[PDB]
Structure 1
Amino acid sequence: SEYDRGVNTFSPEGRLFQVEYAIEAIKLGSTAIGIQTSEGVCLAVEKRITSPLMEPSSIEKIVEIDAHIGCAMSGLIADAKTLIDKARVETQNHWFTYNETMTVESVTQAVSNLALQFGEEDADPGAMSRPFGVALLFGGVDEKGPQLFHMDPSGTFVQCDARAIGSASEGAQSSLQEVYHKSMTLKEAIKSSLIILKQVMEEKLNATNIELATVQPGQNFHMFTKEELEEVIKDI
């Protein structure tokens, strides 16, 4: 039933079946929220711990692409590993060639150029047999100031002022539309992100249920520690 069609067949509506199925697969992931302000970018992801014997510190849904770029992922994290490695290698290659830092848009474009590079026929061994099942939120600070980007397995990437990905991306985006404004500060962005995460998460928000990282002008990628998270969740 799943081999009736190739990986590169269009639907009668003009959509590739596999890309739509990967978009569906995204909605099973944990919710991630990115907010871009004039003071920086903040990323918040639900860890979604399954068992208390599990160590939440081993879950890495926020990663450091470079000193000025961070990535939040939702969907199939094992699929996001290779994309994150490609992003890191691209940033290092750009530094080697040009002695400068990549812009967030160029990194997102380089990662998105890998999305549709799948297919059975006319493919080298080791090529991708299917699209990726992850949505990436790229947040960073470059010469154009802090910027937030969203990428999906369709290969499309756009700039976002504030976006949510994952299972609760519909309710969170509606909440993001109300709370967000252009004059928002970084502290306000973090507080609103944590409030929306608490609203959408099944379990009670705490210092181990979530990840939170920030990138600011003049400061590297910074992942919040447990004491900082405890301080932020003190009053919400």
Structure 2
Amino acid sequence: DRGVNTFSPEGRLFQVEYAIEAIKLGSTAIGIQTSEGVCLAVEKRITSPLMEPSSIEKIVEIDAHIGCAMSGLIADAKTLIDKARVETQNHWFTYNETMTVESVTQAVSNLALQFGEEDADPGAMSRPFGVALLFGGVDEKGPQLFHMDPSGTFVQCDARAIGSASEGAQSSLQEVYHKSMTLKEAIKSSLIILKQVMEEKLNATNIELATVQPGQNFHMFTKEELEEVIKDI
């Protein structure tokens, strides 16, 4: 009944629609692209004080110039991250260069929606990945920010927020973001919006923040740095 590959009366796939819906349940994540660099922030959403907040990694590195922020079935995000890293290193090994952000996202996206049931593979994926990746990095073209939805659709975006607070996080990003914004201004604006959407009071332990700049590599802010920014924000 209702095979995974089925069409609705509107021409809409059922599974792809559901998977996109599941995204809303995930925590918030804000990614802003600026000429000085690209910044990412996220809400850790600590379940319980016993849990070690270090082990909830919502911002990982794909290469020295690429970073990703996740939201959705974090279990599903793992395989997507592994493919991105392998593709980046394979490209370096063959062409002795650094893959561009769009190319990595295109490679990752090509993994999304490559699922089936009959005559596909001995152990192919059955269902779509329910996670929305915010790729951010610096390439020959400068800073780049790409959002990826479960539908395998990636589209460069100036500023975007994903997660349960996406609607309203985007709205706030709309009123503040502008082309000439600097990295620090992006970081602060990102922190405020994350603070507004976050029910729990925002402190230095419940939010992961990272940035990529033309000079420096992918950098994940430490507690000392995080405290400094939220002190003024």
TM score, norm. by length of structure 2 = 0.99
Structure 2 portions without partners, runs of 5+: none
- Cα offsets for 1:17-69 (capped at 9, x unmatched): 00000001101000111000000000001000010001111001100000000
Deviation at 1:123, TM superposition (A): 1.4
Deviation at 1:119, TM superposition (A): 1.1
Sequence identity percentage: 100
- Cα offsets for 1:75-102 (capped at 9, x unmatched): 0111010000000000000000000000
Deviation at 1:161, TM superposition (A): 0.3
Deviation at 1:14, TM superposition (A): 1.1
Separation in 2 of the partners of 1:122 and 1:151?
27
Deviation at 1:7, TM superposition (A): 0.4
SS in 1 for 2:8: coil
Aligned pairs for 1:190-229 within 5 A = 190-229=187-226
- Cα offsets for 1:107-134 (capped at 9, x unmatched): 0000000111111111111210100000
Query: Which of 187, 191, 194 does residue 184 from structure 2 map onto?
Result: 187
Separation in 2 of the partners of 1:233 and 1:136?
25
Moved over 4 A (4+): none
Separation in 2 of the partners of 1:126 and 1:151?
24
Separation in 2 of the partners of 1:222 and 1:209?
18
Deviation at 1:197, TM superposition (A): 0.2
Separation in 2 of the partners of 1:169 and 1:125?
37
Separation in 2 of the partners of 1:194 and 1:84?
25
- Cα offsets for 1:192-218 (capped at 9, x unmatched): 000000000011111111000000001
Separation in 2 of the partners of 1:22 and 1:179?
30
The equivalent of 1:99 in structure 2 is 96
Structure 1 portions without partners, runs of 5+: none
Deviation at 1:15, TM superposition (A): 1.0
- Cα offsets for 1:121-178 (capped at 9, x unmatched): 1111121010000000000000100000000110110001000001000010000001
SS in 1 for 2:70: strand
Matched, 1:136 2:133: yes
TM score, norm. by length of structure 1 = 0.98
Separation in 2 of the partners of 1:141 and 1:45?
20
